[PDB]
Amino acid sequence: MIQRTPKIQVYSRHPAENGKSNFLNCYVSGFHPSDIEVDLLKNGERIEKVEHSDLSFSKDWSFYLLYYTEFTPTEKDEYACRVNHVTLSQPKIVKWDRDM
Amino acid sequence: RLPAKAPLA
Amino acid sequence: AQEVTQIPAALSVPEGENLVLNCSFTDSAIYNLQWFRQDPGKGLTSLLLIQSSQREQTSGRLNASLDKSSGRSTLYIAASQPGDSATYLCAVTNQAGTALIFGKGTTLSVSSNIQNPDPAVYQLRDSKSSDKSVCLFTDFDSQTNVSQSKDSDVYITDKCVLDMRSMDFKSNSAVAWSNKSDACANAFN
Amino acid sequence: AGVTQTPKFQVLKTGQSMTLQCSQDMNHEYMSWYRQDPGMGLRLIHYSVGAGITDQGEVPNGYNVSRSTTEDFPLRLLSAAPSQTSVYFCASSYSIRGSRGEQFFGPGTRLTVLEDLKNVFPPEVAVFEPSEAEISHTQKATLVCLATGFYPDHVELSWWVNGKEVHSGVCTDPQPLKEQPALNDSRYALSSRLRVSATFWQDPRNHFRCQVQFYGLSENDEWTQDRAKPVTQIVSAEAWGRA
Amino acid sequence: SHSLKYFHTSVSRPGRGEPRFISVGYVDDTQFVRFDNDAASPRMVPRAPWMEQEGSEYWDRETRSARDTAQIFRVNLRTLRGYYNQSEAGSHTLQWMHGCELGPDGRFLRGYEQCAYDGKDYLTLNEDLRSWTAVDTAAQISEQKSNDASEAEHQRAYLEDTCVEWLHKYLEKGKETLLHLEPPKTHVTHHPISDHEATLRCWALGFYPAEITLTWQQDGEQDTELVETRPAGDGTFQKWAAVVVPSGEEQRYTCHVQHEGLPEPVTLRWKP
DSSP, X not given: XXXXXXXXXXXXXXXXXXXXXXXXXXXXXXXXXXXXXEEEEETTEEOSSOEEOOOEEOTTSOEEEEEEEEEOOOSSOOEEEEEEOTTOSSOEEEEOOTTO | OOOSOXXXX | OOOEEEEOSEEEEETTOOEEEEEEESOOOOSEEEEEEEOTTXXXXXXXXXXXXXXXXXXXXXXXXXXXXXXXXXXXXOSOOGGGOXXXXXXXXXXXXXXXXXXXXXXXXXXXXXXSOOOEEEEEEBTTOXXXXXXXXXXXXXXXXXXXXXXXXXXXXXXXXEEEGGGTEEEEEEEEEESXXXXXXXXXX | OOEEEEOXXXXXXXXXXXXEEEEESSOOSEEEEEEEETTTEEEEEEEEEETTEXXXXXXXXXXXXXXXXXXXXXXXXXXXXXXXXXXXXXXXXXXXXXXXXXXXXXXXXXXXXXXXXXXXXXOEEEEEXXXXXXXXXXXXXXXXXXXXXXXXXXXXXXXXXTTEEXXXXXXXXXXXXXXXXXXXXOOEEEEEEEEEEHHHHHOTTOEEEXXXXXXXXXXXXXXXXXXXXXXXXXXXXXXEOOX | OOEEEEEEEEXXXXXXXXXXXXXXXXXXXXXXXXXXXXXXXXXXXXXXGGGTTOOHHHHXXXXXXXXXXXXXXXXXXXXXXXHTTOOSSSOOEEEEEEXXXXXXXXXXXXXXEEEEETTEEEEEEOTTSXXXXXXSGGGHHXXXXXXXXXXXXXXXXXXXXXXXXXXXXXXXXXXXXXXXXXXXXXXXXXXXXXXXXXXXXXXXXXXXSSOOEEEEEETTOOOOEEOOOXXXXXXXXXXXXXXXXXXTOGGGEEXXXXXXXXXXXEEXXXXX
């Protein structure tokens, strides 16, 4: 059976400006099978108002999902994406870097 | 528009 | 959904004649078309199955053709026999290809040839006395239509043909009766 | 065995629940339920593409099915209604899409739903002996049977010569007549002919019986009318031959 | 060069009832519909603003087609567990991708269908759309069954006619979004990773469609980290290409961006 680990990108819709409203995106791609836990975190705390795209897949059959929430980035606040998948021994947490 | 028919494997 | 039309709804033909039962379907994306025979009070039995890939199937005096483009099947019945008399039902696969959709059926009556018609009305007494009687119209031509009474008090049946195998004899008959005391002579027409 | 269906005939009071049984032992993945009505052909109620998988047909309302096994496809009438008076056919096939597309049908279930079972009556049966005018003119003897006052239209007529069912020299009316064509719950009449040689009818060793099997109320159906319960039963009339 | 594509996923969950089934429709790189059997009454619903105009006729039909696919794919999952001699306890994935493309002329260019079992090519509709083809030997019985049923014919008629017909209809509805080329807003950022090396990251932001080529070159004469193209979440896409260069030598490197919405390729160089 094919088991592919998710590639996790955490990024803003628009260039990040502290205090200006934005969208925090977590894009999980290149994963198989489809079963995947994805949570957006503010300061280690799971965000509730979190929407996710409809499960689709690429030419190589690997799945992709966008998890997004409305957010106002600040100097002090830390945003991350927590992803659990069969291929991962433990939940994988990716911090939001403004420069990636 | 979806196809009416899905292939039976 | 898939919709099946059978033309005509009823057919009455003299035995020995060729005849066509027709089946048209609105959605031509079908896997199979199937023709069924259904005798009174019986289930359906499959006569012919035509795959979308095939153009015709033959079974004795039955030939069924399939034209996907025009979206229809013709069931050709050669040299029709009274034994062909039945309800003929056409089915094609639904759009999903998961079950069969049926038309309303064509009821075929292949009328028996009455060699020497001898039309006569007779009166029959109830075996268990009572002075109850019925009127029998018999030995008339297969092309003779039986008139409905239209009276509430007088009853008249449709014709049926019976086969006396032993005497190689066939004969039509219709029955008439009433619960009055006021005649067979002029009962049928 | 092909496709099995029970029961052959059933009367229901409006609001009663009922399971129409269907089995096949051909291991078919594809099973379906149709209702046949005069001039309406077969209309798909529910279909199954495998065990535990069922879906709605053209006319699914009023009915439930279950496909627990490959063998069984029970049809459930949750609350019987007069409009569900029909003949219900169960069907199976190895394949819907492939070359193995032959569809096998069960013998069918005649269902009648009535407001009152009050209108339910068994047939009265009379045999009418041949005309002497017929015997002399044709040298043949037509026996007429007449079943009268039965409701609903739940009868099988058969002729029995010397205790053996005849299948030739016979024809029954294709449709029963309504005794009161005006009345919507009108009781029915049915006639049948047995034609033999004058010789055969003139033999007093020959015994002629018209048999009408009526399918009415079962043991379970409640009945408190000042009248014998109109159960499923045979009613017959007899006649011996003579000069 | 437009396309109408659907991506179907069926996932068995033994003990927990019916398999999970999801369909998603795309016109080019824009999702416009979806179906998810995870709901009380699961239906096809609009997933693009320009798709809300459609009537109950469309949604009832698409719901019916989606439910029929889910039912068939539930059967297919049983059949495939059987073929591979797998336990009834395990979860297994069936994927079905189908799409029709238009040429420059706006006529049918080509159609394609594949299904995959557990992420692997299983059965492919040939180029001619006349027959299905087993990829590995395990799909051979599916090829025999599909050809016996002439499955290819029904899929061909779909891809050549109704797929092309409705692509033209979708392209019309919300031509505002679908036919508009959004060029990439491009810049280069500099990220010292060590004393001796820095990352040059070439950005393409807020572009449509998704197709884009980011390449790094060196003056006189390169190895590139190419991140998966990602949605911005507004229908536009983001991508970056990164190259590790010796610290102080960043200005020797050029990024080259090719996009439909650019009249000619764009060249960027990092400026301190």
